[PDB]
C-alpha cells in the first residue's frame, strides 16, 4: 500500500476508536465528576483535558 | 509498503485505540473525580492532562 | 518497507493503543481522584500530566 | 446533663454531619463512578457500601 | 454527667462527623471509582465496605 | 462523670470523627480506585473493608 499525508491524518484498519483533533476539544470517554463546593478566584477545580494560552 | 508524512500522522493496523492531537485537548479515557471542597486563589485542584502558557 | 516522516509520526502494526500529541493534552487512561479539601494560593493539589510555562 | 437511650441514638453538639441508620442504606457523601464495560454473571463491579444476605 | 445506653449509641460533643449503623450500609465519604472492563462470573471487582452472608 | 453501656457505644468529647457499626458497612473515608481490566471467576480484585461468611 501507499500513503502520503500532510497532517494531521489518522489512518488505520480494524480499529475500535479514532480521534483526530486540531483545535479545540474532543471528549469521547467516560467521565464522572462529583463535587460539593468550589470557591476561590480562580481555581481550576477539576480539569481532565485542558490547555491555557494568553498573549 | 510505502509512507511519507509531514506530521502529525498516526498510521497503523489492527489497532484498538488511536488519538491524534494538535491543540488542544482530547479526553478518551475513564476518569472519576470526587471532590468535597476547593478553595484558594488560585489552586489547580485536580488536573489530569493539563498545560499552561502565558506571553 | 519504506517510510520518511517529518514528525511527529507514530507508525505501527498490530498495536493496541496509540497517541500522537503536539500541544496540548491527551487523556486516554483510567484516572480516579478522590479529594476532600483544597486550600492555599495556589497549590497544584493533584496533577497527573502537567506542564507550566510563562514568558 | 443526663441521657438514657435504647438505641440507636446519635446525640451531639456543634456537629457538622450526622447519620443514623437501621436498615437499609444512607448515601450522603461525594461519589464518582466512571465505568466502561461490565460483563459476567454476576460480578459486583463497583460497590461502595454494600451488604448481602440470604436465607 | 450521666449516661446509660442499651446500644447502639454514639454520644459526643464538639464532633465533626458521626455515623451510627445497624444494618445495612452508610456511605458518607469521598469515593472515586474509575473502571474499564469487568468480566468473570462472579468477581467482586472493587468493593470498599462490603459484607456477605448466606444461610 | 458516670456511664454504663451495654454496647456498642462510642462516647467522647471534642472528637473530630465517630463511627459506630453493627452490621454491615460504613464508608466515611477518601477512596480512589482506578482499574483497567478484571477477569476470572471469581476474584476479589480490590477490597478495602470486606467480610465474607457462608453457612
Numbering used by the authors:
A (entry chain D), B (entry chain B), C (entry chain F), D (entry chain C), E (entry chain A), F (entry chain E): 45 to 99
Excerpt from the publication:
In this work, we determine the cryo-EM structure of the N-terminally acetylated E46K α-syn (Ac-E46K) fibril at an overall resolution of 3.37 Å. The density map showed a right-handed helix with a width of ~10 nm and a half helical pitch of ~68 nm, which is consistent with the AFM measurement. The fibril contains two protofilaments that intertwine along an approximate 2-fold screw axis. The high quality cryo-EM density map allowed us to unambiguously build an atomic structure model for the Ac-E46K fibril. This structure represents the fibril core (FC) of the Ac-E46K fibril consisting of residues 45–99 out of a total of 140 amino acids of α-syn, which is slightly smaller than the Ac-WT FC consisting of residues 37–99 formed under the same condition. In contrast, in the Ac-E46K structure, this segment forms a β hairpin and extends from the FC-C with interactions to the side chains of Q62, T64, and V66. In the Ac-WT fibril, α-syn subunits fold in a flat layer; in contrast, in the Ac-E46K fibril, β6 and β7 of the FC-C swap to the next layer to form inter-molecular side-chain interactions within the same protofilament. In contrast, in the Ac-E46K fibril, the E46K mutation breaks the salt bridge of E46-K80, which results in the breaking of the other two essential electrostatic interactions (K58-E61 and K45-H50-E57). Alternatively, in the Ac-E46K fibril, K80 forms inter-molecular salt bridge with E61 of the opposing α-syn subunit to involve in the fibril interface, and K45 directly forms salt bridge with E57 to stabilize the β-hairpin conformation of the FC-N. The exposed segments 74–79 of opposing α-syn subunits form typical class I parallel in-register homo-steric zippers to mediate the inter-protofilamental interactions. Thus, the relatively loose packing of the Ac-E46K fibril in comparison with that of the Ac-WT fibril may explain the decreased stability and increased sensitivity of the Ac-E46K fibril to the environment, which may associate with the pathology of this PD familial mutation.
